Design an enzyme around this catalytic site. Structure first.
Site, PDB file in Angstrom:
ATOM      1  N   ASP A  35     -57.329  55.264   3.533  1.00 33.72           N
ATOM      2  CA  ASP A  35     -57.875  53.879   3.711  1.00 33.72           C
ATOM      3  C   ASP A  35     -59.164  53.604   3.800  1.00 33.72           C
ATOM      4  O   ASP A  35     -59.790  53.906   4.979  1.00 33.72           O
ATOM      5  CB  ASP A  35     -57.200  53.401   5.094  1.00 33.72           C
ATOM      6  N   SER A 199     -70.738  42.577  -6.119  1.00 36.00           N
ATOM      7  CA  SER A 199     -70.515  42.309  -7.175  1.00 36.00           C
ATOM      8  C   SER A 199     -71.360  41.297  -8.050  1.00 36.00           C
ATOM      9  O   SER A 199     -71.779  40.475  -7.328  1.00 36.00           O
ATOM     10  CB  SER A 199     -69.104  42.087  -7.450  1.00 36.00           C
TER      11      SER A 199
END
Length: 330
Positions: A35, A199
């Site tokens: 994770d 992004s």
């Protein structure tokens, strides 16, 4: 040193991925959920409340000649999905894919929430976010990666998750055979303890690319892609009959649909998520309403590039003094 381990989807939807991990001496192999959005290595154990164990493999420290109680240390964690676990702490030898760390904090669960009990395939979590998020008190502990780092050939790990197929986690090297083209690296902020990056924009299907900054985290422990409501609405508007269902808890679409792809920007590069990656199948067994793999982050407080996005790429988690993320097509 290096390590290389295969990671396998737990079910036909790629809801999560498990990776075998050796703990203790002699080895006890547990299948952990790696994770990148958390920083605790915790396991089902001989200490876990018996009614909360249903098929998991447990770690038994008393059978490990290298286990030592980390006296006084406790841990307690709550995840973004509302799940939780807590317990005490041992140190022990942990190996992943041939890479061994001695003295790793292995957080032994005394209690786990129902979602963990109900998932027989996941024996615990191995956190790979920054060690500043580790929950052990009163002495915070390091992740497996942070403990391994100085021994690794390069201070990196890579995630290469499969679509309905096994993939790989590598530590200490970048497998140049595992991706196509070049790797585009992007800056990381560690201020919240995550692999947080920005992004450069998105496109829906064959549509034009929208240049827009989307801050979010690279999180292998989250199944879906959670993005701002504007972006998510723009995607699902291209699917006839798709709608946001408050009763189901997100966007659903007709199972008869063909989904468009979703592209996200990494610098000037582009990662394309095929439409089929966004199909999470019937909302209930036999339903003709299917659950979408792109969902709004509005109710979370952060955008999450979870497995739907990451499995479309070869992803480099560069843990050098200045961390960075890299993405390549594959």
């Amino acid at each position: 040193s290096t390590g290389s381990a295969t990671t396998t989807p737990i079910d036909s939807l790629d809801d999560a991925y498990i990776t075998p991990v050796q703990i203790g001496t002699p080895a006890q192999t547990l299948n952990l959920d790696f994770d990148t959005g958390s920083s605790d290595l915790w396991v089902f154990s001989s200490e876990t409340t018996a009614s909360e164990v249903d098929g998991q493999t447990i770690y038994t420290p008393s059978k490990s000649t290298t286990a030592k109680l980390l006296s006084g240390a406790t841990w307690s964690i709550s995840y973004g999905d509302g799940s939780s676990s807590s317990g005490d702490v041992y140190t022990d030898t942990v190996s992943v894919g041939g890479l061994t760390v001695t003295g790793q904090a292995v957080e032994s669960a005394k209690k786990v929430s129902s979602s963990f009990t109900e998932d027989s395939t996941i024996d615990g979590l191995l956190g790979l976010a920054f060690s500043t998020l580790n929950t052990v008190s009163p002495t915070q502990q390091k992740t497996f990666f942070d403990n391994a780092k100085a021994s690794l050939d390069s201070p990196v790990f890579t995630a290469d998750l499969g679509y309905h197929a096994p993939g790989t986690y590598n530590f200490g090297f970048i497998d140049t055979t595992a991706y196509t083209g070049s790797i585009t690296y992007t800056a990381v902020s560690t201020k919240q303890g995550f692999w947080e990056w920005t992004s450069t924009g998105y496109a829906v299907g064959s549509g034009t690319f929208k240049s827009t900054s989307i801050d979010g985290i690279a999180d292998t422990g989250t199944t879906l892609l959670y993005l701002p409501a504007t972006v998510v609405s723009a995607y699902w508007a291209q699917v006839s009959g798709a709608k946001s269902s408050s009763s189901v808890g997100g966007y659903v679409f007709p199972c008869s649909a063909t989904l468009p792809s979703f592209t996200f920007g990494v610098g000037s590069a582009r990662i394309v998520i095929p439409g089929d990656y966004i199909d999470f199948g019937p909302i209930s067994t036999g339903s003709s309403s299917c659950f979408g793999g792109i969902q709004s982050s509005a109710g979370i407080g952060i955008n999450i590039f979870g497995d739907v996005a990451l499995k479309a790429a070869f992803v480099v988690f560069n843990g050098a003094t200045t961390p960075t993320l890299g993405f390549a097509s594959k």
